[PDB]
Amino acid sequence: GIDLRWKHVRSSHRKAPKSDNVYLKLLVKLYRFLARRTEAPFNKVVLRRLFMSRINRPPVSLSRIARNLKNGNEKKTVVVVATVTDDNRLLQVPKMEVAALRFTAKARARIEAAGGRTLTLDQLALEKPTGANTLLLRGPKNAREAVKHF
Amino acid sequence: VAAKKHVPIVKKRTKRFMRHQSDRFKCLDSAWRKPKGIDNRVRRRFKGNLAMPSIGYGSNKKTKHMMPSGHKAFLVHNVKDVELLLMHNRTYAAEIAHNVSSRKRIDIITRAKQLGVKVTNAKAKV
Amino acid sequence: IPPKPRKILQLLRLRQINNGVFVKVTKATAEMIKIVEPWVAYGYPNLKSVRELIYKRGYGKVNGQRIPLTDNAIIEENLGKYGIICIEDLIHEIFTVGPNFKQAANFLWPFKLSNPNGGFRPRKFKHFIEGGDLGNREEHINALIRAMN
Amino acid sequence: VRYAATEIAPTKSARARGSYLRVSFKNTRETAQAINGWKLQRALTFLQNVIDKKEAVPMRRYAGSTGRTAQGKQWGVSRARWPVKSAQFLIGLLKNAEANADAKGLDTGNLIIKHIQVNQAPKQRRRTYRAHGRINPYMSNPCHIELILTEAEESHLSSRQRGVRIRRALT
Amino acid sequence: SNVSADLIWEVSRNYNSFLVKQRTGTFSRDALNLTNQHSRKHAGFVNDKALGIVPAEKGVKVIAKKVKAANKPASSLYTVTYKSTARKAYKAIASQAAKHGYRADLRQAAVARASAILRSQRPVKPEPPKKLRGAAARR
Amino acid sequence: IWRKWHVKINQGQKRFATASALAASAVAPLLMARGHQVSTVPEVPLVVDSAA
RNA sequence: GAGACCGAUAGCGCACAAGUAGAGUGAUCGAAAGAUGAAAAGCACUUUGAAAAGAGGGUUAAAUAGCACGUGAAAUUGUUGAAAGGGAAGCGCUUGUGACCAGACUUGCGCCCGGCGGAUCAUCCGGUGUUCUCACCGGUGCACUCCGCCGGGCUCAGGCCAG
RNA sequence: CGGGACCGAGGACCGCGCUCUGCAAGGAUGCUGGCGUAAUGGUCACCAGCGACCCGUCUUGAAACACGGACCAAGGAGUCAA
RNA sequence: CCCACCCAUACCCCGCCCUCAGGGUAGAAACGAUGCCCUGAGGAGUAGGCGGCCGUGGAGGUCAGUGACGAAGCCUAGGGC
């Protein structure tokens, strides 16, 4: 026998989505290829967030996107691996180019009316395959009733 | 026809795993059941007792599910089933299901002879 | 085994019986080996012992994996920044205890030896000076290396 | 109806059968085993001697705490009895089989009991009263008897082996 | 758009009506499936460009998918019957599989299937009589 | 009898599933994969004149 | 009128002369128990027995369905065959003996000759389809070319145990 | 420089090399014999050498005590709702 | 005190099974990518936790499934996985 005081640890992170969405499966295949064949850390982060669950993907509002568009970020492509929601407290939506998993109808309509562009992640892979000139945004993770009651 | 060339087939254990005390009680079937008594000698693995199945007895991945001729059994019910083995006569053999009638068996055997497919029970119902 | 000798064996990378390591003699190592004397036999290996151990049972730790030292290219990729590009360089560094002895010894996987041909002494778990096998047998470790290699 | 001995053909054999016969199965088994394999006339004479207490049936399996007699020495035992009722039932069956052989035209002077078998019939369920208001079974264990009477009646060698055999044949 | 061969594979990779699943392997009844194996490489009903070979009265019959008629099932198959020498059949099948880039990865499988069908169309040889062996069987 | 026999489904998810099934009904590979015999159908989706 | 219910130890206690038979002074308690066969065609006649029945002979597609009745498990029993047994058997590892078996093999492929039997040889022309350069169809081959068959010869690959 | 035992994983080429027409260099080939069937192999029964307490439950730290088990078939115990 | 010898599931080498880990694999001649290829390490287990599979009654779809030329069931010192 061998004396192993320490213990080899199995991985504690997701390697595949639990979702049976076939479009998400195709997106996972695409970003697996991209993260394997490119040196960009952006593709690895995007693939690992595509693995994640819904409580680990909180929504991002247009007010949050407009907040992060300030100070020289007006021309960067906004990348959100989550749902982009509308905020009616924000009366004036600036022009922006956002790629997301999905948009709400009001958020998509308000972006297109303000003159920006909405993209999917495969369109993001086509136009910025290495994630150049991109602003990666996450929503508030701890802003949940369960997390408040923890 | 003859099977594709393969590594020699090795069975790590030929004898079956018999249930404890199934040789002494007729109400106990000889099918394996893992002993769960905390004082059971077979569960505690004393020497001179029945062996317990484990994954270390597993067969080689290259020869698993191979009959001694080197083929893998494929259960067939009709001529359309046996024609699925057109491209695998050196890897899969055909085995006619038990509830297939004699005349349909003759049809399957004739088609399998044309396709060069081994039939495991070709002498049945003759 | 008590926790302190267990920890010292874990730090000396002696986790299995008949595992062997090369140690550079300082006070900080000699005191550890003196503590774990009831479980180990140690001594001063010669050039023949070093070269035969490295040639027959030499394994390098590459990306956490145990790779046999069958080519000089493995030694070049994993020790070439210290000037060790061949197995003769590795043997020289281990034998002469050079400036990169720590890197060479830690690159060497702990040697998994067999039981000795001819056996141990009749009572194995006494000190060497009492007629046993434990402790420092000095230059007599070479015969044990021949028997267990 | 099917007999247990299916190998025996019915062209030159004679069969007899009795079912649900209220006679002791154990005694009947012992009597049948005593007369198993005998001549028909010898079996009939022996069963009459059993009825007249001149020859005894050896008790071999069903014999626990039975008596001992001098008439077991013919069989090499000490425990033997005289099951008169079993002998009467078997005499009736043997006479029926002899009549069947006469109807078929066989010679009864050369017939042997090739097959004889006693099986347990469904039990007769009487009851008996015990102490303290208890009722126990008082059953009978009857038997089915059947019997049938019949007329009494260098390859793949090696080359070295072949050469040795030819040399020894020539020499 | 919303439909691709990749998506059809993702939908029907776990179950479809052509699937035959057993302990020793998974097979497919699909007509455009060379080697009758369940995989994306061989799923002819899934793939946009695909080939299939069936026996004829004499020779082989090869069907190929037409990419411009995917929504028209009655006119989606390009069918040629080869009833000629086996070498010419192999040459034509390999030409329509590899020369214009129409699934050059299926060339070996297509030639193999044509060869198997043409060998199956040969007359069969009579089997030798069974030799009785042992003790009970010989006597 | 007060076992739960009926399942409440969101109408939006019902309409989503109906749209997905109608979208899958216009894919000729999926029709063959569901065991339908459509090899002689001139076009999928099959539209017949209302005069007939 | 129905059922993603139960299928005769289930489902109501009850699928049957069931709130019956039966028990209790009484209030009350309360079962067990369905299936021959399509059709009784439910065995004429002879023979043996006092009879029950048995044997022949019949009916039936089948009595290996005989009002003990579809199928007919196990416990347990009888016969026959084989075996073991000096105060327990049973079980594990590994040989041997005896009995009984599943496979595997039987020849294939490729050449060189000779003999047959046919021109779905190469090229060109026209039509058609296609992946738009690849094919099929109709004419053209006039037998040193193609395709099968039959005899030989040669090489290779072929089963088991071994040196 | 001999003598012996056990093993032959992989499956076009690629690499490190060497004694460089080639090789013992990133894993066995070559030659030959008998047999081609119960001969090898397998199952069953038995003898032989060695090994081997009767299960479940309970108890405490554990044993022991104690409890249940003549045998077989069918039935038989973490369900539903809020 | 000395020499040789015996053998544990311990130690060394080799094969195989599983688990874990680290790599590779698309202008796809391209794959049950839920696949395949390469490499290394590890393997006892009560209470307890988790995963994958086998089996039974019934429901939808599918296999243009099997079947009076014999379904289901049952017996089997007959075989295969």
Automatic annotation (TrEMBL), chain A:
GO terms for cellular component: cytosolic large ribosomal subunit. Residues 1-150 form the Large ribosomal subunit protein uL15/eL18 domain. It comes from Chaetomium thermophilum (strain DSM 1495 / CBS 144.50 / IMI 039719). The lineage of its organism: Eukaryota, Fungi, Dikarya, Ascomycota, Pezizomycotina. Belongs to the eukaryotic ribosomal protein eL18 family. This is Ribosomal protein L18-like protein. One of its GO terms (biological process) is translation. One of its GO terms (molecular function) is RNA binding. It comes from the Eukaryota. Keywords: Ribonucleoprotein, Ribosomal protein.
From TrEMBL, chain B:
One of its GO terms (molecular function) is structural constituent of ribosome. Mg(2+) binds at D39. One of its GO terms (cellular component) is cytosolic large ribosomal subunit. The keyword Ribonucleoprotein applies. Keywords: Metal-binding, Ribonucleoprotein, Ribosomal protein. SMART domains: Ribosomal_L32e. GO terms for biological process: translation. InterPro entries: Ribosomal_eL32 (IPR001515), Ribosomal_eL32_sf (IPR036351). Pfam families: Ribosomal_L32e (PF01655). The keyword Ribonucleoprotein applies. PANTHER family: 60S RIBOSOMAL PROTEIN L32 AND DNA-DIRECTED RNA POLYMERASE II, SUBUNIT N (PTHR23413), RIBOSOMAL PROTEIN L32 (PTHR23413:SF1). Belongs to the eukaryotic ribosomal protein eL32 family. This is 60S ribosomal protein L32-like protein.
TrEMBL record, chain C:
This is 60S ribosomal protein l7-like protein. Mg(2+) binds at P122. Residues 1-40 form the Large ribosomal subunit protein uL30-like ferredoxin-like fold domain. GO terms for cellular component: cytosolic large ribosomal subunit. The chain holds residues 101 to 249 of 249 of the full protein. Keywords: Metal-binding, Ribonucleoprotein, Ribosomal protein. It comes from Chaetomium thermophilum (strain DSM 1495 / CBS 144.50 / IMI 039719) (Thermochaetoides thermophila). GO terms for biological process: maturation of LSU-rRNA from tricistronic rRNA transcript (SSU-rRNA, 5.8S rRNA, LSU-rRNA). One of its GO terms (molecular function) is RNA binding. It comes from the Eukaryota. Belongs to the universal ribosomal protein uL30 family.
UniProtKB/TrEMBL annotation, chain D:
InterPro entries: Ribosomal_uL22, Ribosomal_uL22_CS, Ribosomal_uL22_euk/arc, Ribosomal_uL22_sf. Signal peptide: none annotated. Pfam families: Ribosomal_L22. The keyword Hydrolase does not apply. GO terms for molecular function: structural constituent of ribosome. One of its GO terms (cellular component) is cytosolic large ribosomal subunit. Keywords: Metal-binding, Ribonucleoprotein, Ribosomal protein. Coiled coil: none annotated. GO terms for biological process: cytoplasmic translation. Mg(2+) binds at Y129. NCBIfam families: uL22_arch_euk (TIGR01038). Belongs to the universal ribosomal protein uL22 family. This is Large ribosomal subunit protein uL22. It comes from Chaetomium thermophilum (strain DSM 1495 / CBS 144.50 / IMI 039719) (Thermochaetoides thermophila).
